[PDB]
Amino acid sequence: MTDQAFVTLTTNDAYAKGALVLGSSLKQHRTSRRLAVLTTPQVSDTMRKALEIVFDEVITVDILDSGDSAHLTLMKRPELGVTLTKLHCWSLTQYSKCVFMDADTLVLANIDDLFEREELSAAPDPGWPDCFNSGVFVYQPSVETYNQLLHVASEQGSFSGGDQGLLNTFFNSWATTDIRKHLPFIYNLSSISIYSYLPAFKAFGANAKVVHFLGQTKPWNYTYDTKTKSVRSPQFLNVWWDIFTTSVVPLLQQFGL
Amino acid sequence: MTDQAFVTLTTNDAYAKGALVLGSSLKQHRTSRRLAVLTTPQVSDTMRKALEIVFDEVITVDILDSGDSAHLTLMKRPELGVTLTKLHCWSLTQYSKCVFMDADTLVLANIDDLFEREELSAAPDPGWPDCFNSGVFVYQPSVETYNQLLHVASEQGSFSGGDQGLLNTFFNSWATTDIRKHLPFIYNLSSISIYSYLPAFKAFGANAKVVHFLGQTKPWNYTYDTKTKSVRSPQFLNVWWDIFTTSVVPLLQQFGL
């Protein structure tokens, strides 16, 4: 309850919109857990203030600062900035277990049953199914684990150039051990797989609990007609935008005054 | 040994080439098991004679014939012809356990350790990871299972229009039960995933044991330069063609006389 939480990350204003929509969807589906968001100084004060309303806790992380434990690793591998910031989710020891969710995900149903899982539980990644997608995962905050992950990032880095390669390298028993750590694909449904693999989606896609907006074009990069309630050339994108239009935009207007 | 086998299928001459290359690769990597191939009457006598040399057993199946158990189901769902023919692999009761492999796969290393698995074991399919790819799977021949599969094909059909949808529908506990039934992706490596997802491949692709040539263009649809030993605009395609050029073509020439 109080010691369990959903955790996300925003490094800029664009992703803050996603985090705001994500946090709003979790509230909409009545989660009994806390909502936390990791933010960087590059996130504007207005976005930060909106995050303070949606989330129960807003944690500031600045790996560009010499006083950060990951700063030194950043100097060694500067392309891992976002990955190193994300790794700070393991530093949230005020929580006993968390579900990390990237800011480009969207909750369509209550997913509190994920807290029944153990670290590290995650859904299979499309493309290379023997690796888990790092967009949604159940983990246990721990300083020791954080230090071990930083160590791997420093010595080996990431084979994907992002957090997914590093996480799969560290939690390498996932593919061959414990089927319970394989979260069903509906808990992290790739937007690509939906519009791409039609037959499979038509058969199981109605059970989708979480949609992960992948690819270059993010939800906030689309144009949304407020009258017809649809994006321009989409059900999931329309849900994202309905929440953004209904709950997020008017919230951001509260500060103009 | 004698009661265990690798099983494939050829419904035409094009796929017979693939079956010949597949069977040759299994011999090349010294399998201790038998090699069986299901063939239809549409396969020419010359291809059939070549199959008789490569494989230990060539079984003829003709679902277009009224005397076939699947014929009636074919009349009801004529688009399932190939699927119904493939299902006859369960009718090979002379074997206690088999590894089915589509004719468009290629073995790069001995995979006899697959016989340690139980029905139904298969690798995750890219695209919709919660479904297994039906290109490579461990099963147990049984008349009862064959009848149950025919029944599902008749009543429900296939959500994918092919054998994969039907097999996943019948063996539906795969995604959530027994991690041992999840064959590592290297035992059925999608050719698409290789040329598509580069980072992941560069990291684990060297361990590939089986390559599955997916997409519209099959290996036999490419042009191969015998001098430079390479296909025209590829390592795996070149291996396929080296086997085809070295072992298969000269075998097919034995019959011209």
From Swiss-Prot, chains A, B:
Residues binding UDP, per UniProt: 9, 11-12, 15, 77, 102-104, 212, 215, 218
UniProt-listed Enzyme Commission number(s): 2.4.1.186
Binding site for UDP-alpha-D-glucose: 9, 11-12, 15, 77, 86, 102-104, 133-134, 160, 163-164, 215, 218
GO cellular component: cytoplasm; nucleus
Mutagenesis / variant outcome for changing residue 83 to M: Loss of autoglucosylation
Similarity-based family: Belongs to the glycosyltransferase 8 family. Glycogenin subfamily.
Name the record gives this protein: Glycogenin-1
Organism: Oryctolagus cuniculus (Rabbit)
